[PDB]
Amino acid sequence: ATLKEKLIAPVAEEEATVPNNKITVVGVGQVGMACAISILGKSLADELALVDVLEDKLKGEMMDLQHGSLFLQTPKIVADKDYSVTANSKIVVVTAGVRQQEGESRLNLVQRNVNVFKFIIPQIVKYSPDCIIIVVSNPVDILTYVTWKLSGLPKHRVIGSGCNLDSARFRYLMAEKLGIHPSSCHGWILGEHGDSSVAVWSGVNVAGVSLQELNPEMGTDNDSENWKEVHKMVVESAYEVIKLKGYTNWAIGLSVADLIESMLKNLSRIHPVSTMVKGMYGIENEVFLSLPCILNARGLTSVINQKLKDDEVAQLKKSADTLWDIQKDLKDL
Amino acid sequence: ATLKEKLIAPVAEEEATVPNNKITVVGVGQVGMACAISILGKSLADELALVDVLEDKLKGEMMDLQHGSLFLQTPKIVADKDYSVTANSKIVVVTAGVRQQEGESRLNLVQRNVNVFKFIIPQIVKYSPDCIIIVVSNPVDILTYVTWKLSGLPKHRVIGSGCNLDSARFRYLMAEKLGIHPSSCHGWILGEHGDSSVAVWSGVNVAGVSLQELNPEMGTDNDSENWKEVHKMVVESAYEVIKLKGYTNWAIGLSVADLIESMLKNLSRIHPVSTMVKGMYGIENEVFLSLPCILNARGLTSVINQKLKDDEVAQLKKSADTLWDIQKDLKDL
Amino acid sequence: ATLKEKLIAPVAEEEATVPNNKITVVGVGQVGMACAISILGKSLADELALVDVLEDKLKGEMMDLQHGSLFLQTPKIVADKDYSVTANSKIVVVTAGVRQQEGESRLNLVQRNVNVFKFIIPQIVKYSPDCIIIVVSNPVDILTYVTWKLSGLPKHRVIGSGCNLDSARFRYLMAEKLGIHPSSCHGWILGEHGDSSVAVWSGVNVAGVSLQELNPEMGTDNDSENWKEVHKMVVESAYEVIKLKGYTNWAIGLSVADLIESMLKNLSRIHPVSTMVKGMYGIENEVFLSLPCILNARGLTSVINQKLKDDEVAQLKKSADTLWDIQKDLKDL
Amino acid sequence: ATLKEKLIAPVAEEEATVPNNKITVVGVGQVGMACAISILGKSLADELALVDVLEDKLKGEMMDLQHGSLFLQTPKIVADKDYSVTANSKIVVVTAGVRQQEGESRLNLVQRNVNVFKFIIPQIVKYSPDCIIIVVSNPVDILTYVTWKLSGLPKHRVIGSGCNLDSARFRYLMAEKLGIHPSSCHGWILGEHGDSSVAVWSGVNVAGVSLQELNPEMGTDNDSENWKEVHKMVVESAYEVIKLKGYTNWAIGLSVADLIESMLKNLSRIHPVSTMVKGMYGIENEVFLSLPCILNARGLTSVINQKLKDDEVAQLKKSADTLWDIQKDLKDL
Ligand SMILES: NC(=O)C1=CN([C@@H]2O[C@H](COP(=O)(O)OP(=O)(O)OC[C@H]3O[C@@H](n4cnc5c(N)ncnc54)[C@H](O)[C@@H]3O)[C@@H](O)[C@H]2O)C=CC1
Ligand SMILES: NC(=O)C1=CN([C@@H]2O[C@H](COP(=O)(O)OP(=O)(O)OC[C@H]3O[C@@H](n4cnc5c(N)ncnc54)[C@H](O)[C@@H]3O)[C@@H](O)[C@H]2O)C=CC1
Ligand SMILES: NC(=O)C1=CN([C@@H]2O[C@H](COP(=O)(O)OP(=O)(O)OC[C@H]3O[C@@H](n4cnc5c(N)ncnc54)[C@H](O)[C@@H]3O)[C@@H](O)[C@H]2O)C=CC1
Ligand SMILES: NC(=O)C1=CN([C@@H]2O[C@H](COP(=O)(O)OP(=O)(O)OC[C@H]3O[C@@H](n4cnc5c(N)ncnc54)[C@H](O)[C@@H]3O)[C@@H](O)[C@H]2O)C=CC1
Ligand SMILES: c1ccc(CNCCc2c(CNC3CCCCCC3)[nH]c3ccccc23)cc1
Ligand SMILES: c1ccc(CNCCc2c(CNC3CCCCCC3)[nH]c3ccccc23)cc1
């Protein structure tokens, strides 16, 4: 009778399909939408759900993505302020809450964003008890800890985007100096995604050539080439971009899509992401900060043990102390 | 104690992989390996299993693929003569059996390849009772029927690669004449993957312009442009390529990867593939042949009802009669 | 002496890059950045230049993209307010200018954006005399005409993004009703990217089945299924999304990346884009509006002639009249 | 008058198109066709030309690829025994000649394959004087030297596929031991693509952790974990695969596509490929062997200088001496 009934003959009985690689993005602001477009561009989701408290903005973002469906391979894009829309997600990316004002530390956002997370996180696990949560909201290390405590998920299923972005920036800036692709320039930023991050100069290399072996002063204040300035540029990068355009989003969206790719393709690639590091490098408390971690379909399955220089371990311990001083006073977790 | 124990600190205490996007290719001949490399190139499997009777060849192919892992996103590639290696496959591609000699009809392979399938199909469903089977071995329409009977699987989970390849050839040949990309030149080959195929000239179009409306003689024997010769070239293509290089493999490997993409990405794209067409176009028996079908993560869920011209319906019925003449005499299914 | 001199031994004594697959995006607003991220995600440029009048915002966007380099395959990302940065671009995407307020016609933007284009287009061709220009700013059909006049380029090198986006929206909405992928649901929106667009109901098809042959009332006011409402939703879509989120950007960014892919891959795929249609369907003036066009590495090399129904031709002529009424009064082009 | 003339209205004059990223594959054997399918799969060629002395096999391979065009983004696939078909190639991949029989050294193929190259290489440069040549035929290091002498091309435009494959195998075997993706396991095989290859144990690392710092005996005969066996497995791999399936092809096809991607995308990624190493590591003659090299659109533009252990330098010099002993006895280059 209907055009659809004239055109389409069933072979199978119409039955509810459960998606196999659903992704939710919580928060459809600058970061959440950069994450969404990068996930859709890399064909990483068979279903994409969006949540926000701004109902009109949310519906607009959902419709704009839906209009691009012809160019994508994501057959279902949905959005609602209600967390029921997020059911059966494999990965939930949390970008909701407040961002830095100009010259504001990420650590100054802690009380506001803890209050946002207190109501969101229990709803995420209610509807997707088997998900991995990727925390992006700042300060990302503290809010990964908070998400672990609120969610009751195992450690391997609560990941902070952490220093995957800082390390991308570091590798870009070193690769630009050397005239090579960042993928061929190896270097790790660890610890806090923020001012106390640690540059592991001792592991920086190109084709397995230690650059600190070529320039032993690399990373010190007594270096005629002032490589230390590259780590200062990594630390200052968010502040500089926020002064120019108000926020950052494109690089973090690609960084989050890189983490999702490793997990949904089950690759066991190593990324510097935020995890619980008690018992590593003499850290005595449940600090979350970035170390090199193996990521696959289970989540964050292992941490790489490193031989660090004394000044590197000292900076990592200082970063841990900086974060623990905030974590220890958090209430009702 | 081991280097691995020194380097890698567990976060998850468990290392077992849950079966997920596993594909098996049965047969490691020219077609099975083209299927395998196209599945790996398009990142369509997290686990690829190869099964075949030829143990040395199978191990060599497995090792050669494993050596390219750095360039791929498939973390597990395995191979064995025993079907236990195929356990918990979501899709199984069947390419094993005899192939055409020069000038040989695909229909002449039926007794030999039915005997191969009486062995193989029960082993597939023993180890993957919840799989989708894509049949590629020839004659593909008859062997799709045979696989359906032997497997006990529902219709929507047994698919013959069918005329997805014939249609690709048809679109290439018409697009070459018009100077456009085959993706912009729409045309359907239906029925037997073989000599009795149907060119649906009444549906051939560019930008929704019916080419038969522009040239009503298109596909008739009274056409000065002789468009009918294009269908003759589609029918003869396998024989011409077999005469020149001995077999065909690259285009069918890409065609199979196209079908898998629609299913694993859950897209509900329409392909001309082999399904059970009883009750369509006056067909009274359980004939399998190619019609436009919707493919998604459930398998083959719908068929498109078409308005055909009399000469199109007549060739489709002739195709069904040709195939049923062989099907009706099959024993012990 | 330097770490770079210690590490890197020249084989080639020269480092300059020969200009090749360079793309400029003019405008770093919502649309320019969606275009930029989609071009980078699809690896469509070896060099991306951003040009804009807002120097701080431009530098911030350039830095944010640069920080994602590790995740991309574009080795050079540059930005300046001076058009010297755009030199030797193969493709220039123009997204600069004013956009619609809530409820505002795209045609109300004409005087403002003609003033923008009178500055921008001469600067583009000064620095890239051999480029293809893709016009995105609204009203896109009028500004494609203005760009043709100001640039002195041949017709095949000046393209309006046009109805590629309207057609994607149309195919999304029809595919959603039928439960299929938009890539399997064929349908064309022609004429103005705006209120006077034409839905070619006579060409709408699935697997070469004309849907108007199944439902002759499709696209008329006397249709119990009211398929006409789908064309109304296409026309209203920009206004609805602007009401909800303030602007549109994701779908047009993907649409522009689709056009660039056809051209840089030299594919001769057909897209409904804005071109000079004098002499077509009795149009007597140099009107620009969308028809199905072949796109390849030369640009826009052909238009598809269509057999249209009387109501489709009537709307196309009305669309042409609507645009010519504005074009005829333009001065100093 | 013709259907094409009714359907397609010219905007531009029909003009001969010069491809911008044409690739030729010389030899359509097991390696040449693995190269071709990997190039087509990664969308690296707007035109693909095939050359072989076997005219029928060549035409059949061309047709089988053409039949897959709908699934590809390569609008022109051509093939001929005449090198005029290769004109205006950016990259020419040479796979032609004889391969190893079972247990045969690659070095034993040198006189036969030099005789093939003496005829081929002058014709390649005649028709594509601006190309990069990637040598794959064995013994690859000596034939890269021979191709340099015969071609008269600059060093940076003559590249041997070299140890890109050996290093992929090495990284796969180490990554399998550690349970990580090969892309996260860093290790270099240098020198001859063959029995005298050098494992740079001192540069092997995961996340910038030197594995030889964890196990100082790594690569010695006095190692309880016998990591040296992994290098033996790399050396023996081609022989083992040749014993099982007769040849190798899939891994080298993906390795060649990786080198092409770096060059056509202008990335300046580092690969261990065969280049002229006179003046490096006390090598006094025009030896070609693999070192880490930067690859971009210019070709092989730099070599990475490494700090190697004494035993590693000794092995590299022994590899150079092994290759020079063959190069010095070659006639009429
Ligand atoms: N980890 C990293 O590397 C980076 C983190 N960030 C962080 O990402 C977060 C988001 O930044 P933007 O997207 O630029 O901010 P934004 O202001 O553009 O968007 C934030 C969104 O969160 C929504 N939201 C607020 N409260 C909510 C609640 N209770 N439930 C649901 N949605 C809620 C808002 O309505 C808004 O749409 C910030 O915390 C920022 O500091 C930003 C850049 C990089
Ligand atoms: N549906 C389509 O469009 C196409 C179908 N084909 C069909 O694909 C099949 C495979 O072709 P190729 O790979 O070229 O053949 P091939 O000879 O290269 O490989 C045949 C494979 O099946 C195995 N096999 C052969 N005889 C067997 C037996 N008696 N029992 C168990 N395993 C056996 C072999 O060990 C080998 O792995 C043929 O039936 C051929 O007609 C070929 C091309 C296109
Ligand atoms: N063709 C299509 O399908 C679509 C077209 N558009 C059009 O794209 C254009 C850009 O929209 P958005 O990016 O959302 O706007 P936006 O306000 O976010 O960005 C506009 C950009 O143009 C620059 N610009 C503004 N006024 C200028 C002037 N007087 N001179 C020079 N540069 C100037 C701004 O600095 C900024 O870079 C608008 O004309 C809009 O109507 C919007 C969406 C889809
Ligand atoms: N560098 C590497 O890592 C690897 C190198 N190889 C080498 O690749 C080469 C090709 O191996 P396969 O493809 O397996 O051999 P194959 O025997 O399958 O194909 C070689 C092709 O070269 C053609 N040919 C012979 N002389 C020719 C000439 N004068 N002009 C044009 N074409 C000519 C033959 O007709 C044949 O089609 C061998 O030298 C082999 O050792 C193989 C694997 C990996
Ligand atoms: C002679 C001696 C040593 C070599 C090979 N050098 C490999 C050494 C190496 C380092 C340096 N590790 C530092 C060393 C100081 C102790 C504290 C921190 C760890 N980083 C890498 C990153 C990647 C690869 C290797 C390395 C060659 C010749
Ligand atoms: C019997 C008669 C005819 C057929 C199949 N006919 C397919 C025809 C067709 C149309 C309809 N064209 C219109 C109709 C006339 C009004 C003026 C404009 C042109 N659109 C398509 C889009 C795609 C493919 C085909 C078509 C089958 C059986």
Numbering used by the authors:
A (entry chain C), B (entry chain B), C (entry chain D), D (entry chain A): 2 to 334
Paper text:
LDHA is a promising target for cancer therapy, whereas LDHB is necessary for basal autophagy and cancer cell proliferation in oxidative and glycolytic cancer cells. To investigate the binding site, we solved the two crystal structures of LDHB, that is, the binary complex with the cofactor NADH and the quaternary complex with NADH using the substrate analogue oxamate and the inhibitor AXKO-0046 at 1.80 and 1.55 Å resolution, respectively. Both structures exhibited α/β protein folding conserved in the LDHA and LDHB structures, as previously reported.
The crystal structure of the quaternary complex of LDHB with NADH, oxamate, and AXKO-0046 revealed that AXKO-0046 was an allosteric inhibitor distant from the catalytic site. AXKO-0046 was located in an interfacial allosteric site between two monomers, approximately more than 20 Å away from the active site. Electron density was visible for NADH and oxamate at the cofactor- and substrate-binding sites, respectively, whereas relatively weak but distinct electron density was visible for AXKO-0046 at the interface between the two monomers. These results indicated that the compound had alternative conformations on the two-fold axis of the tetramer with relatively low occupancies. The indole ring thus occupied the small cavity composed of Gly204, Asn206, Gly209, and Ser211. Two NH groups of benzylamine and cycloheptylamine interacted with the side-chain oxygens of two Glu214 residues. The benzyl and cycloheptyl groups were exposed to the solvent region and surrounded by Lys308 and Lys310, followed by the C-terminal helix with significant structural rearrangements. The substantial conformational changes in the active-site loop, accompanied by the conformational shift in the C-terminal helix, were associated with the binding site of AXKO-0046.
